């Protein structure tokens, strides 16, 4: 009746009829189809109910409860019979010895005589068991009821089995400048501990591995902590189950550490990369840093913000590099990196002015100069009172002096030398 | 584990009438014991040997020998279970000695020898000698056990025996491999007089690290009867990326006498600098 | 008839459980194996789990077949009962048989020559 | 309640196949040690139980990889026992769970 | 080495008819042996004890016990030589068991005990149990030997026994020695209830060296019956030359129960700086 | 050529004096180790031979003074032996030189 | 009469020399000893060398009697023959006796209390 | 007949009569004075000849050869008899069984019948042996011939026994600046080696001790080498004999090292000592060293050369010390030491002149000054042309300025200050 049966092995048939059990794993085999010179019992069908056993409060296991209906057939008034249930199933092999004794009242020829129930056939999760029931001595062939069991995947299976999720608690603790791993294992309980950085290819990337006798509150180093940090624990017993918890996926301090460890590196003139431990996608774009000050003005417009991915190589749409060109990386628009790639390749920063070309009205060329306060479309009136040194840079450009950095059907960027004016 | 031959394996020696019956390894005395109990076999010892059979084949054989205690219990002695239990498989092997005339007089230490048990090389056994009648339950033991062990084929006197030669001990490949300038490797070896498949196995690593850089296998189907002892050159391309160079190969044979377990013949050439 | 062959003896029938009342390893092993139905109504137990190595080599962490290792079978000798006379559920005769129990991964034998 | 048995055994494993094994307990990725389970009251008297030496498996270099697990292959086998002389029966058939060998397995992970 | 008492030392226990004859340690079977040979005494063991005698004195005694082998040779068993050979003196001690009825049936492990051998503390012995009839020359041994040993009087259960108390274990001097300012040393101690001479022994050394600077003895003749337990002050002059100071003394007693071998009771006081 | 002897021994050392010795082999200035000389053909069957552990003696500090010598005290004692059954006599009396203990002596100097 | 007491046996008479044919230690020892004539024509051997400690303490390198050490005697049990009947050179009876063989120097037993 | 008998044990009686020996250490005891019902033999006296045994060339031992004369007495024609020689002597105990058979020709009642000789009774040196000879069965009481043996002190004993002096050769080798100890032991022969400095009290003074497996040629250090150096060697066997060789007693290099190591030390104003390792007596005297130069002039006269002994304390006959007074030590007049004792107590050297007083003619005082060229009796004419500065020192002396160093009934020494003249 209940889904929480006791620790003892005993039989309980339907009312009226009396019965007994000898759970001694008796030797059971088919034998032969013997004759029935009188009223003899025989099985009709087999059943498999969902029952659980609990020896103590913190200790529970499965009990596949089985039931066999019998009936009078064949050629004192109390009809007696011996039934068997040969559970030749994986992993263990055990038999059962029932003893049905249906009294005179329920004796009906060609009709049922109640039912018998054994508690229990403890079967493992994910093992298609074999229930072979036959009379003692045998009359009918063993009835096939090859029950398919659920792994740790049944809905009610998770509600009772501790193997399913319930593993010693590791409470999250990102309190202060110390990240604590609070453990709730017993003083005498030993365990294995492993921390690693997961990603797309080559999932394992360990940072710390050790055997411990808990409960030790381990304080983590922010050097090895990033959103990829995952913990795996297991008790020191062979075949013991583990669990992979990756909580730092959206922790603020972990992402702060991720970016300070990430680095930008130029591979070749037309190739660069973002080297970060945790592979988290983010965007990037070229910027123009002034040599005097450092207010880096982004070149958007006319250039585009590229979809960057960690460990994915990208190419520049530039004919040549310039030391004032620096890459800016942002995630959710908040700026993270402003490293100048050509600071070693062509640095230090040159005070060569940058121009933004675009086709003006009447098909003519319309130029502009990148100033700290946006851009100034020149030739034009100047803050220097005269028509600006841009009037002379305009000549340098059409006389082929200026360096073309970016080329497009609609525009172009030019690095013009101002080293002949101060 | 097997008898050398079901021949005249009889123990009738001077001053001793008896016969060695091959038994099921369960004397009648184990089942229904007696109040009497003979002495234990003192100073049990086993020694390996090689006896050429009627066919002409040589096999590794176990020679067992021991001495009886000079106590009065030597009179009440029916015989012995010369058990040779292999530990890898728990398979039971034995022979039941049975005395016609019961032992008397003493004067010289009685001794028995048994040169008729074929053993499998590189296997640990436990040679127990159970004197008969076997003791009663809750009774003293009348036996001695010895963990016997046979050495591998790398031993000179083992390599020559039948189980070693069929496994592939005599066989020597003579790996005339060549570092071809075209980023290729010319594998080559002579094969043994047995029709079976051989598979080449490549693995590459840098000159200063145990970690690998590349792996590749190359199958060779069963050679024909005329193709026995023939040289099998099977050249393969090396994806020699600048950094990797210390190539290492092992021709894994698959003879009937062993299969994947067989003796792999390796060859290695380090990175040539300069 | 008893006493004609003294090898006939009575047996309790009720098996003494040496804590057999108190696995998925075949699929989780680096040297996995499959089970075959070596069944027989005349032999005890009726159902048997014959395990022979599924892979010739061993499966590495990535799932590849690693040819630098070999899967080897583990066999044992066990006692079983066989009906004597046939189909008579009263008497039996002992038998020793070979069974393939499971597999394990082993390093190959090597002979290193420079 | 009682069954008769003829202990005149028939040795059916007398195949003596061409394949002859070697000492696997040390060659395996999951090494094991063997214990002499000796009991004269039981037949077979001696049974050699193999039990895993390490919790983890051996990596290519030669160290215990704690990220993998060595597990024993436990086999239930039939054995006879001399039942006391006072008890009605003279012999009793018993089922014993014993460790046969070891194998290397991937551990389970619950998300 | 001696019997506790020549009393009813008989081995007639249930299911066993016999008597323990005190022997010369040389059974008739040693001289004229027989073809029969009994089994060895399995698991021989000895355990020390203390049994209060008829007089009221307590003595250290050796309790010996062993079990016979369950082999057929147990039938042909006459008895045993319970030898207790002291190694310091090679003196032989033993008792000859002699069976009226010969042993039969088995069923329970037969066992014998012998609580009648006084032992001298701090002496190594070899308790051999030679089953009878003794074996033939060039024959297997039917005996087991055990190197028994008795602990010194410093053990709590030994100090209380008779041999320790007469030696001078109970006695405590209570050395009320005083560093007299007149370059003298006031030796003093209480004596035990036994008339014998006691001799004081002085030795002096510097505070930073094991080497000595002076030596002197002072005799004390045998005290009278009333002078038992009396305090004996015997002050002596110290030739305290500047450099030496760490004086050391040991009252060497000379009781009848030991003489020069006796327990010396020492006392030491280092050089007091400041 | 032959003499008769009654082996019914008379134990005359049954004095059991008040002085009871202690383990001298380690306390001595000349330490020694004892060997079990066991022979069932001879009576007494067992004799414990003491042989000097060091060439020199032990000084007050506790070291082997090579300027002094430890020497064994060898005593010839009477012992009986079972003469073979083929030889005319059944027993033969023998004299054996055996090491009893050790003592510290001053070495000799020849000018 | 032989056979009346089985303890009567024949003896070879010609002693088997266990290399007794193939000392001054008493005077050179730090624990010297003197020899006494414990002679008897009825006992074999007739002459005996009873050795008892000469000095109570031990003699040091200078020749002084050092009271920080004790000379101790070494006794043994040896078998000897005594005439039975008296003065008849044909038969004997065994006897076990105590003999003082030599001396040695030993450190005294001490109980150190602060 | 010979003093070099073979290794075998055999008897050889006087001519004519035949005899045999059974050297089996038979059981021998007196028994009883039996009756003689016929002619029986008896001993008259015992003899002890000097004989030596040699098994091989390099292996020899002693053989105390004994002889017994017999005679017919008491109440076939060949008279037979059995003789015994009970050698109950220290250390080993062994008996002998002779078999004399004197034929009919030498049979004379009341007269001698030849003699019997046993080879041999190997007795140790320095052991008063006991020879007890009596008939078998006994007639006469055992004849006393308690022979006193010589230790390794007999004249012929040294000529044959190797224990007497012959010990592995250590050849003396004071060749070059290296003193070699050449050893002649075999390659497999082990030995103990000890070197020490002997003297009057406390003979042992070790410098080097070690166990070695020779033959090693050990080179000695001249630091530890002096005339007191003695060597002691012995094979590594218990109770093995040693020998003390002291050859450096009159070696030139050893005495050279002795003096360079010896030192002079002032104990108190009126006490000093000579500290030398080897105690060798020698003489000494006070000297006067000049402050300018160093030609030390001895003060003999008027002072005396004292008989000095090493480690023996001496006293000065001086009222006070002076830095210019230095002790001079010589052995066989050759100078060894010239150390200035008061160089630390009252030094450095003062240029105060020393005077030698003596009673001149007519009872008057006669003074003199110690100059580099002997002494100058002053007041006197001077090399300084004037009557010398001695004229003024003469005044300083009688006015109590000068320091009296030595006092005598016939003379005196004075240290006068010259620090008021230059
Ligand atoms: C940590 O513990 C608190 C209770 O103190 C609980 O509310 C919280 O869920 C725990 N967190 C984890 C991850 O177990
Ligand atoms: C974990 O351990 C702490 C120890 O202070 C305790 O307060 C907490 O309740 C424990 N939690 C569990 C689930 O055991
Ligand atoms: C790529 O850039 C576009 C710009 O509109 C943006 O919408 C998108 O989120 C970026 N990231 C990815 C991974 O597509
Ligand atoms: C003994 O060997 C014979 C053949 O030589 C065979 O018939 C018999 O069955 C064997 N018995 C056993 C138990 O091996
Ligand atoms: C045995 O003891 C008795 C006295 O109780 C004594 O007469 C007899 O001689 C003893 N025998 C031996 C050999 O100790
Ligand atoms: C040293 O050897 C020589 C012979 O070379 C010999 O004349 C000399 O006497 C030897 N000296 C000693 C001390 O043995
Ligand atoms: C000593 O040894 C040397 C080794 O060269 C040898 O020449 C010399 O003759 C030896 N002398 C003696 C006496 O053995
Ligand atoms: C002492 O001095 C005198 C001076 O004449 C001299 O003869 C003698 O040899 C010296 N030495 C000794 C030790 O007497």
Q: Do F55 and H232 touch (CB under 8 A)?
A: no
Chain D: give the shortest CA distance to residue C16, in Å. 5
Query: Which residues of A lie inside 8 Å of D (Cβ-Cβ)?
Result: 25, 27, 92-93, 152, 163-165, 167, 192, 194, 204, 209, 211, 232, 234, 236-244
Strand partners, E203: E215, E248
> Which of B2, B6, B91, B95, when mutated, tests ligand 4's pocket best, judged by the most ligand atoms within 8 Å of its CB?
B6
Q: Which helix (H) or strand (E) holds H364?
A: none
**How many CA atoms does the CB half-sphere of D5 hold within 13 Å?**
25
Q: How far is CA F98 from the centre of its chain?
A: 5
Give all chains having 3 or more CB-to-CB distances under 8 Å with chain F: E, G, H
Q: Is residue H84 part of a domain?
A: yes
Check CB contact of B215 with chain E, cutoff 8 Å: no
CATH number at residue F45: 2.10.90.10
The C-alpha atoms of residue E177 and residue E189 are separated, in whole angstroms, by 8
Coil vs helix vs strand at B213: coil
Picking from A54, A43, A57, A113, the residue whose alpha carbon sits closest to that of residue A85 is A43
Supply the range of the domain harboring residue F49.
Answer: 24-105
DSSP-derived pairing of the beta strands A82-86 and A10-11 = unpaired
Element (H, E) at A89: none
Q: Nearest residue CA, atom 1 of ligand 7?
A: H184
Closest CA to B32 of B174, B154, B149, B136: B136
DSSP of G73-98, one letter per residue? EEEEEEEEEEESSTT-TTEEEEEEEE
- Sequence length of chain E is 274
CA distance G15 to G13: 6
A291 lines ligand 3 (CB under 6 A): no
Residue G84 in domain: yes
Query: Judging by beta carbons within 10 Å of its beta carbon (0-12, 13-18, 19+), is residue E39 exposed, middle or buried?
Result: buried
Boundary (domain end) residue, out of H230, H252, H274:
H252
CA R_g for chain E = 27
Q: Residue F34: inside a domain, yes or no?
A: yes
State the Cα angle at H332 between H330 and H338, rounded to 5°. Answer: 10
Which protein residue has the closest C-alpha to ligand 8 atom 7?
A: H307
- Specify if C7 maps to a domain: no
Among residues H329, H345, H361, the one where a domain terminates is: H345
The H or E element containing residue E221 is none
Question: Which whole-number Å values give the CA distances from H267 to H275, H282, H406, in the listed order?
Answer: 12, 20, 19
Q: In this structure, is residue A48 part of a structural domain?
A: yes
- Under a CB-based contact definition with an 8 Å cutoff, are residues H376 and H393 in contact? no
Look at residues A364, A338, A357 and name the one whose alpha carbon lies nearest to residue A413.
A357
Strand residues in A123-262 grouped as ranges (E): 132-136, 143-144, 170-171, 179-183, 190-197, 206-213, 218-220, 229-235, 244-245
Peptide bond into F52 cis (omega under 30): no
Tell me, yes or no, if F100 comes closer than 8 A to chain G by beta carbon.
yes
**CA H298 to centroid of ligand 8, rounded, Å:** 18
How many angstroms separate the first and last alpha carbons of chain E?
A: 57
**Does the residue H2 lie in any domain?**
no
d(CA G4, CA A195): 95
The reply to whether residue B264 touches residue C109, judged by beta carbons under 8 angstroms, is yes
Domain count, chain A: 4
- In this structure, the answer to whether residues A308 and A204 fall within a common structural domain is no
Question: What is the CA(A339)–ligand 3 centre distance, in A?
Answer: 22
CA distance H52 to H62: 5
> Same domain for A19 and A115?
yes
DSSP 3-state of G66: strand
Q: What is residue H136's three-state secondary structure?
A: strand
Distance from CA of B107 to the nearest CA of E (A): 9
Indicate the pairing of strand H282-288 with strand B96-99.
unpaired
Q: Which domains does chain B have, with CATH numbers?
A: 18-156 (2.60.40.2160), 171-268 (2.60.40.2150)
Q: Do F103 and G30 touch (CB under 8 A)?
A: yes
Q: How far apart are CA H94 and CA H85, in angstroms?
A: 9
Q: Is H281 in the pocket of ligand 8 (CB under 6 A)?
A: yes
Contact criterion met (CB below 8 Å) for H70 and H98 = no
Does A116 lie in the same domain as A26? yes
**Rounded to the nearest 5 degrees, what angle is found at the Cα of F90, between the Cα atoms of F88 and F94?**
105
Residue H171 CB less than 6 A away from ligand 8: no
Residue A24's alpha-carbon distances to A88, A98, A124, A134, D93, in angstroms, are 15, 10, 21, 17, 11
Chains B, F in contact, 3 or more Cβ pairs below 8 Å: no
| Angle C47-C48-C54 from CA coordinates, rounded to 5° | 140
Closest CA to A264 of A292, A287, A230: A287
Closest CA to D100 of A86, C23, C42, B30: C23
* DSSP classification of residue B188: -
Is ligand 8 within 6 A of the CB of residue H24? no
How many residues in chain B? Answer: 274
- Chains touching G (at least 3 CB pairs under 8 A) are E, F, H
A115 contacts: CB under 8 Å, gap ≥ 6: A13, A14, A67, A68, A69, A70
CA distances from E266 to E239, E251, E269, E272 (A): 21, 7, 11, 19
Residue nearest atom 11 of ligand 1, based on CA coordinates: A171
Q: Within this chain, do residues H327 and H275 fall inside the same structural domain, yes or no?
A: yes
SS3 C69: coil
Same domain for H105 and H240, yes or no, is no
Tell me whether residue G74 is in a domain: yes
Deposited experimental method: X-ray
**Cβ proximity of H169 and H115 under 8 Å:** no
In a domain, G17, yes or no: no
Q: Which of H31, F96, H92, E29 is nearest to G78 (CA)?
A: F96
Residues H377, H396, single domain; the answer is yes
Give how many domains chain G has, as a whole number. Answer: 1
- Tell me the DSSP string of A223-243: TS-STTEEEEEEESSTT--B-
SS3 assignment, position A111: coil
User: Residue C111: which of B172, D93, B34 has the closest Cα?
Assistant: B172
Q: If we measure between CA atoms, which residue out of H248, H264, H263 comes closest to residue H207?
A: H248
> Residue H85: left if φ>0, alpha if ψ -120 to 50, beta else—which one?
beta
CB contact under 8 A, F109 and H232: yes
C-alpha dist (Å) from residue H28 to F108, H31, H97, H116, H131:
36, 9, 9, 18, 13
SS3 B28: helix
Q: Are residues A51 and A188 in the same domain?
A: no
What's phi and psi for E99, nearest 5 deg?
A: -80, 130
- For ligand 1, whether the C-beta of A245 sits within 6 Å is no
Does D4 reside within a domain? no
Chains G and C touch (3+ CB pairs under 8 A): no
- Beta-carbon contacts of E154 under 8 Å, excluding residues fewer than 6 positions away, are none
Specify whether H323 is located in the same domain as H394: no
Question: Distance between CA E148 and CA E65 in Å, rounded?
Answer: 13
Please tell me the number of the ligand nearest to residue H165's CA. 6
Residues comprising chain H, all counted: 422
Q: Residue E84, SS3?
A: strand
How many helices (H) and strands (E) chain H has is answered by 4, 30
The Cα of B8 is separated from the nearest Cα of chain E by a number of Å equal to 33
Quick one: G70 exposed, middle or buried, by C-beta within 10 A (0-12, 13-18, 19+)? buried
D84 Cα to chain C: minimum distance (Å): 12
Backbone φ and ψ for G27, nearest 5 degrees, come out as: -100, -25
F94 located within any domain: yes
Q: What is the Cα–Cα distance from A135 to A142, expressed in whole angstroms?
A: 8
DSSP one-letter code for G39: -
The residue segments making up the domain with residue H288 are 262-345
* Statement to judge: residues H398 and H268 lie in one domain: no
Q: Are D109 and A242 in contact (CB under 8 A)?
A: yes
Residue G13: closest CA among H25, F43, H83, F41: H25
Q: Would residue H187 count as lying in a domain?
A: yes
C-alpha angle with apex E134: E128 to E136, nearest 5 degrees? 125
The end-to-end CA distance of chain G, in Å, is: 72
Give a yes or no: residue F67 inside a domain.
yes
For residue B84, the SS3 value is strand
Do B268 and C77 lie within an 8 Å CB cutoff? no
**H72 in a domain, yes or no?**
yes
CB D77 within 8 A of CB C76: yes
Query: Subunits with at least 3 CB pairs below 8 A relative to chain C?
Result: A, B, D
Please identify, among H345, H363, H385, the residue that sits at the C-terminal boundary of a domain: H345
Separation CA E209–CA E230 (nearest Å): 36
Phi and psi at residue B13, to the nearest 5°? -110, 165
Q: What separation in Å is there between the alpha carbon of A307 and the centre of ligand 3?
A: 6
- CA-based nearest residue to E177, from E165, E190, E187: E187
Whether F22 contacts chain G with CB within 8 A: yes
Best interface-test mutation with D: which of A87, A93, A163, A238 has the largest number of D CBs within 10 A? A238
A169 pocket-lining for ligand 2 (C-beta < 6 Å): yes
């Amino acid at each position: 009746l209940e889904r929480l049966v006791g620790p003892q092995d005993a039989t309980h048939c339907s009312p009226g009829l009396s019965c007994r059990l000898w759970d001694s794993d008796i030797l059971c085999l088919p034998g032969d189809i013997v004759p029935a010179p009188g009223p003899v019992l025989a099985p009709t069908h087999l059943q498999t109910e969902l029952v659980l056993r609990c020896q103590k409060e913190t200790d529970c296991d499965l009990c596949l409860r089985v039931a066999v209906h019998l009936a009078v057939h064949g050629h004192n008034a109390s009809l007696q019979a011996q039934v068997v249930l040969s559970f030749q199933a994986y992993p263990t092999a055990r038999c059962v010895l029932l003893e049905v004794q249906v009294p005179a009242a329920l004796v009906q020829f060609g009709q049922s005589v109640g039912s018998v129930v054994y508690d229990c056939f403890e079967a493992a999760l994910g093992s298609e068991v074999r229930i072979w029931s036959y009379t003692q001595p045998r009359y009918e062939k063993e009835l096939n009821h090859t029950q398919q069991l659920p792994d740790c995947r049944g809905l009610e299976v998770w509600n009772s089995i501790p193997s399913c999720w319930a593993l010693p608690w590791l409470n999250v603790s990102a309190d202060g400048d110390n990240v604590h791993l609070v453990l709730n294992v017993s003083e005498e309980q030993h365990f294995g501990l492993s921390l690693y950085w997961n990603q797309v290819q080559g999932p394992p990337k360990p940072r710390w591995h050790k055997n411990l006798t808990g409960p030790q509150i381990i304080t983590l180093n922010h050097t090895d902590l990033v959103p990829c940090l995952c913990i795996q624990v297991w008790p020191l017993e062979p075949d013991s189950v583990r669990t992979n918890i990756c909580p730092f996926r959206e922790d603020p301090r972990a992402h702060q550490n991720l970016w300070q460890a990430a680095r930008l590196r130029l591979l070749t003139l037309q190739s660069w990369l973002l080297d970060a431990p945790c592979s988290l996608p983010a965007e990037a774009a070229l910027c123009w840093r002034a040599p005097g000050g450092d207010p880096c003005q982004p070149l958007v417009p006319p250039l585009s913000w590229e979809n960057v991915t960690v460990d994915k190589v990208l190419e520049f749409p530039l004919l040549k590099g310039h030391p004032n060109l620096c890459v800016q990386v942002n995630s959710s628009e908040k700026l993270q990196l402003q490293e100048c790639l050509w600071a070693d390749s062509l640095g230090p920063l040159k005070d060569d002015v940058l121009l933004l070309e675009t086709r003006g009205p009447q098909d003519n060329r319309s130029l502009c100069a990148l100033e700290p306060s946006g851009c100034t479309s020149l030739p034009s009136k100047a803050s220097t009172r005269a028509a600006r040194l841009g009037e002379y840079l305009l000549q340098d450009l059409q006389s082929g002096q200026c360096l073309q950095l970016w080329d497009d059907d609609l525009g172009a960027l030019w690095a013009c030398p101002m080293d002949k004016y101060i | 584990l097997r008898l050398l031959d079901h021949r005249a394996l009889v123990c009738s020696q001077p001053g001793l009438d008896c016969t060695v019956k091959n038994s099921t390894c369960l004397d009648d005395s184990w089942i229904h014991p007696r109040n009497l109990t003979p002495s234990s076999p003192k100073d049990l010892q086993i020694q390996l040997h090689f006896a050429h059979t009627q066919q002409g084949d040589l096999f590794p054989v176990a020679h067992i020998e021991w001495t009886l205690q000079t106590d009065a219990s030597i009179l009440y002695l029916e015989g012995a279970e010369l058990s040779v239990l292999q530990l890898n498989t728990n398979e039971r092997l034995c022979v039941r000695f049975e005395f016609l005339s019961k032992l008397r007089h003493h004067h010289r230490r009685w001794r028995f020898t048994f040169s008729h048990f074929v053993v499998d090389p590189d296997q640990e056994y436990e040679v127990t000698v159970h004197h008969l009648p076997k003791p009663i339950p809750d009774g003293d033991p009348n036996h001695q056990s010895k963990n016997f062990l046979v050495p591998d084929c790398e031993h000179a006197r083992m390599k020559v025996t039948t189980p070693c030669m069929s496994s592939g001990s005599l066989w020597d490949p003579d790996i005339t491999v060549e570092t071809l300038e075209a980023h290729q490797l010319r594998v080559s070896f002579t094969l043994w007089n047995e029709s079976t498949h051989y598979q080449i196995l490549l693995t590459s690593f840098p000159h200063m690290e145990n970690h690998s850089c590349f792996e590749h296998m190359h199958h060779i189907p069963a050679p024909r009867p005329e193709e026995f002892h023939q040289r099998s050159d099977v050249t393969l391309t090396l994806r020699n990326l600048k950094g990797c160079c210390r190539h290492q190969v092992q021709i894994q044979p698959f003879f009937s006498s062993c299969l994947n377990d067989c003796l792999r013949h390796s060859a290695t050439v380090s990175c040539p600098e300069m | 008839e008893d006493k004609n062959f003294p090898r006939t003896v009575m047996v309790n029938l009720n098996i003494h459980n040496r804590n057999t009342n108190t696995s998925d390893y075949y699929d989780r092993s680096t040297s996995p194996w499959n089970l075959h139905r070596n069944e027989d109504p005349e032999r005890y137990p009726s159902v048997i789990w014959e395990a022979k190595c599924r892979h010739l080599g061993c499966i590495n962490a990535d799932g590849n077949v690693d040819y630098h290792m070999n899967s080897v079978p583990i066999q044992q000798e066990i006692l079983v009962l066989r009906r004597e006379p046939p189909h008579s559920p009263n008497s039996f005769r002992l038998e020793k048989i070979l069974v393939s129990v499971g597999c394990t991964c082993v390093t190959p034998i090597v002979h290193h020559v420079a």
